[PDB]
Amino acid sequence: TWLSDFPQAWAETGGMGLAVRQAPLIIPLKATSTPVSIKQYPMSQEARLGIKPHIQRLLDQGILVPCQSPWNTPLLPVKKPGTNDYRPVQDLREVNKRVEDIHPTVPNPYNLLSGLPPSHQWYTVLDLKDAFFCLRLHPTSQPLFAFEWRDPEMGISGQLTWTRLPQGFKNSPTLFDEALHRDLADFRIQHPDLILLQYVDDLLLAATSELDCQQGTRALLQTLGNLGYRASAKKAQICQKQVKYLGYLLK
Amino acid sequence: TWLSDFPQAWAETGGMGLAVRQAPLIIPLKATSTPVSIKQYPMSQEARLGIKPHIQRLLDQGILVPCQSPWNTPLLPVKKPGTNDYRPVQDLREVNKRVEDIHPTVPNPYNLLSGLPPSHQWYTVLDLKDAFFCLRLHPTSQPLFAFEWRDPEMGISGQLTWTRLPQGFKNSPTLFDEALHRDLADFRIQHPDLILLQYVDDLLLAATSELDCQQGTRALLQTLGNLGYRASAKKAQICQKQVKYLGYLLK
């Protein structure tokens, strides 16, 4: 019923998310930074065929697009045999160095976790799937993240870049945490007897009874689905007196 | 023979390293930062027993020591069942925010990899085991990394801190890369017909023939062992015409 009552809230039934209320992000560069182009080492036939399916799927969904940029960072085949199903990892160290640091406004989640009232002993734990891919990058900031993808067989010979917040980018955890926090401000305001804790893509809802936890979890799944986020149905812990959150056992 | 000729160069035969020429590091804090103490959530009997063996071994080797600090960051049980062999991970986000950024002086390794002459076609690839643990922290900077460990059964009730560069600290990769680079400057100077590339704890030696690669690899293992670094014998690729470095196939 959790699956069928809220089909848009789950990665399994609702596809990839897209945070609808979040405007495409602009990434500020340090005032004196210049674009940097790092060399891409020729990939072997085997790593290229292990990686191409991920590149195909991302392209298909609009998550990667062709571009021309003065920036370039290397792609690495994160490792199997050859031809044999690998995955692509981008080394963004040189972009990370040139971008302004963004630090958090949210209250520290560990400190909040320790101040949880004992009246609140029913919990739901959710984790969001592919959370950074829910946030769009503004066209003016997409060039920063380009890499080279030469696959004449694929008919792509040039650079590709990310249209969503990429993994490996130093500010992605903070940028996603701040955006979701702001997106869930209405839920928190509307449900004063529930406590919602979050840390990047890990969420904890706590309530005073099983029935209040059940309704607060339904309202939260309705809200997340509508906002464009997707939880993993395979990992969810719903209305329990004992749960693991952040690896900690709450009981 | 590689194992028996150079017993101090390998993690397997030579123990944990300690870089002998490297002075204990002082970690500069941002001029306006203040110590911060984050709350530690009570660990369950089961995560505590899964984690205690790692804490015991580290204590035994002097890598962790008891202390009293105004700084504190949480320890998380990175996850199994209960009692069941987990591992400890420290969340250093709040210290990472308060420490000055250190950026590299070394030339970019990907760019160097692409400028490798074709005359150089015999290679050895080594990766250093527990490389950050080879570098010591100065006593004045050890307090930054404290965490709470209350195990009255162990007879430890208070904080512990790292005496070596910890994992999770934002500058550790750069600090280790810069130190090893400087430590191997004499080898590079003494063997002008060999090319040594490095990126944090991954090393590539390239030479013009099999015999020159063999002798340069012996000299490099002798040097690393003497400097206090330890390579992983289980991963090494020695004197080959085809190797994988950084996931890239060189052939």
Side-chain angles (χ1 to χ4, degrees):
Chain A
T1 44
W2 291 103
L3 269 132
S4 63
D5 286 350
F6 307 98
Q8 277 280 277
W10 304 110
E12 292 84 1
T13 55
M16 169 142 5
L18 175 64
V20 313
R21 303 211 293 224
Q22 293 297 322
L25 294 169
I26 293 168
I27 301 315
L29 289 161
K30 278 190 214 160
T32 56
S33 281
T34 316
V36 84
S37 197
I38 307 309
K39 292 284 222 319
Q40 167 64 50
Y41 195 77
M43 300 221 191
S44 75
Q45 224 93 191
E46 321 110 88
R48 199 178 45 124
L49 267 116
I51 281 181
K52 143 175 165 89
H54 300 107
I55 301 311
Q56 217 309 69
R57 177 181 66 274
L58 260 13
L59 272 170
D60 251 316
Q61 302 206 82
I63 293 181
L64 291 172
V65 280
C67 71
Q68 270 298 300
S69 180
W71 291 88
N72 196 78
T73 48
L75 208 65
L76 303 108
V78 168
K79 308 194 195 202
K80 317 286 159 221
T83 301
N84 203 91
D85 323 11
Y86 298 64
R87 70 157 140 134
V89 164
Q90 206 174 339
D91 184 340
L92 289 175
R93 184 192 265 215
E94 301 282 356
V95 174
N96 284 341
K97 269 162 68 176
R98 295 181 170 70
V99 161
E100 256 318 350
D101 280 290
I102 127 102
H103 292 122
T105 68
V106 167
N108 187 283
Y110 295 101
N111 282 344
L112 290 175
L113 174 60
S114 269
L116 267 184
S119 44
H120 279 68
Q121 29 176 252
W122 284 88
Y123 308 105
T124 281
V125 172
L126 300 169
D127 66 292
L128 304 184
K129 172 107 192 63
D130 290 319
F132 300 165
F133 291 176
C134 291
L135 305 182
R136 286 168 296 152
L137 286 178
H138 186 94
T140 67
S141 290
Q142 288 171 19
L144 301 185
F145 302 108
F147 55 95
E148 169 178 322
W149 186 249
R150 284 296 160 300
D151 195 347
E153 76 177 357
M154 268 196 68
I156 295 265
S157 270
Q159 288 171 297
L160 295 176
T161 200
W162 296 92
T163 60
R164 311 297 221 263
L165 214 53
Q167 220 92 9
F169 174 46
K170 79 170 163 176
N171 287 341
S172 295
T174 300
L175 287 164
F176 184 76
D177 195 53
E178 305 279 324
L180 184 62
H181 199 266
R182 281 193 310 270
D183 268 355
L184 290 177
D186 284 343
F187 181 92
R188 289 192 303 270
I189 292 178
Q190 291 155 12
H191 307 261
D193 288 317
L194 298 178
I195 290 164
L196 178 64
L197 264 15
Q198 71 176 73
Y199 192 24
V200 191
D201 47 0
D202 288 304
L203 290 72
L204 175 86
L205 176 79
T208 60
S209 50
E210 182 175 14
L211 256 15
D212 281 5
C213 187
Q214 174 175 240
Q215 185 52 24
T217 295
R218 290 176 169 155
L220 181 63
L221 291 174
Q222 186 84 340
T223 298
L224 289 177
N226 280 165
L227 292 173
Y229 303 99
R230 303 281 174 275
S232 171
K234 130 261 209 176
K235 299 174 48 39
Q237 304 160 72
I238 285 169
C239 301
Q240 320 261 212
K241 268 215 158 154
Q242 261 177 231
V243 294
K244 293 192 74 166
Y245 179 63
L246 262 34
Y248 300 118
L249 171 303
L250 324 189
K251 87 155 302 154
Chain B
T1 44
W2 291 103
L3 269 132
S4 63
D5 286 350
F6 307 98
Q8 277 280 277
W10 304 110
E12 292 84 1
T13 55
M16 169 142 5
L18 175 64
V20 313
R21 303 211 293 224
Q22 293 297 322
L25 294 169
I26 293 168
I27 301 315
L29 289 161
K30 278 190 214 160
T32 56
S33 281
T34 316
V36 84
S37 197
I38 307 309
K39 292 284 222 319
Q40 167 64 50
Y41 195 77
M43 300 221 191
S44 75
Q45 224 93 191
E46 321 110 88
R48 199 178 45 124
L49 267 116
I51 281 181
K52 143 175 165 89
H54 300 107
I55 301 311
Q56 217 309 69
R57 177 181 66 274
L58 260 13
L59 272 170
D60 251 316
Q61 302 206 82
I63 293 181
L64 291 172
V65 280
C67 71
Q68 270 298 300
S69 180
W71 291 88
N72 196 78
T73 48
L75 208 65
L76 303 108
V78 168
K79 308 194 195 202
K80 317 286 159 221
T83 301
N84 203 91
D85 323 11
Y86 298 64
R87 70 157 140 134
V89 164
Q90 206 174 339
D91 184 340
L92 289 175
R93 184 192 265 215
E94 301 282 356
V95 174
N96 284 341
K97 269 162 68 176
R98 295 181 170 70
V99 161
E100 256 318 350
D101 280 290
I102 127 102
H103 292 122
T105 68
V106 167
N108 187 283
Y110 295 101
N111 282 344
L112 290 175
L113 174 60
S114 269
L116 267 184
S119 44
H120 279 68
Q121 29 176 252
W122 284 88
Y123 308 105
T124 281
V125 172
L126 300 169
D127 66 292
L128 304 184
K129 172 107 192 63
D130 290 319
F132 300 165
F133 291 176
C134 291
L135 305 182
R136 286 168 296 152
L137 286 178
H138 186 94
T140 67
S141 290
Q142 288 171 19
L144 301 185
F145 302 108
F147 55 95
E148 169 178 322
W149 186 249
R150 284 296 160 300
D151 195 347
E153 76 177 357
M154 268 196 68
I156 295 265
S157 270
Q159 288 171 297
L160 295 176
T161 200
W162 296 92
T163 60
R164 311 297 221 263
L165 214 53
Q167 220 92 9
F169 174 46
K170 79 170 163 176
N171 287 341
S172 295
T174 300
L175 287 164
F176 184 76
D177 195 53
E178 305 279 324
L180 184 62
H181 199 266
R182 281 193 310 270
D183 268 355
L184 290 177
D186 284 343
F187 181 92
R188 289 192 303 270
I189 292 178
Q190 291 155 12
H191 307 261
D193 288 317
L194 298 178
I195 290 164
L196 178 64
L197 264 15
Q198 71 176 73
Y199 192 24
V200 191
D201 47 0
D202 288 304
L203 290 72
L204 175 86
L205 176 79
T208 60
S209 50
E210 182 175 14
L211 256 15
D212 281 5
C213 187
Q214 174 175 240
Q215 185 52 24
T217 295
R218 290 176 169 155
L220 181 63
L221 291 174
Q222 186 84 340
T223 298
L224 289 177
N226 280 165
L227 292 173
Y229 303 99
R230 303 281 174 275
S232 171
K234 130 261 209 176
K235 299 174 48 39
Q237 304 160 72
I238 285 169
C239 301
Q240 320 261 212
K241 268 215 158 154
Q242 261 177 231
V243 294
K244 293 192 74 166
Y245 179 63
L246 262 34
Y248 300 117
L249 171 303
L250 324 189
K251 87 155 302 154

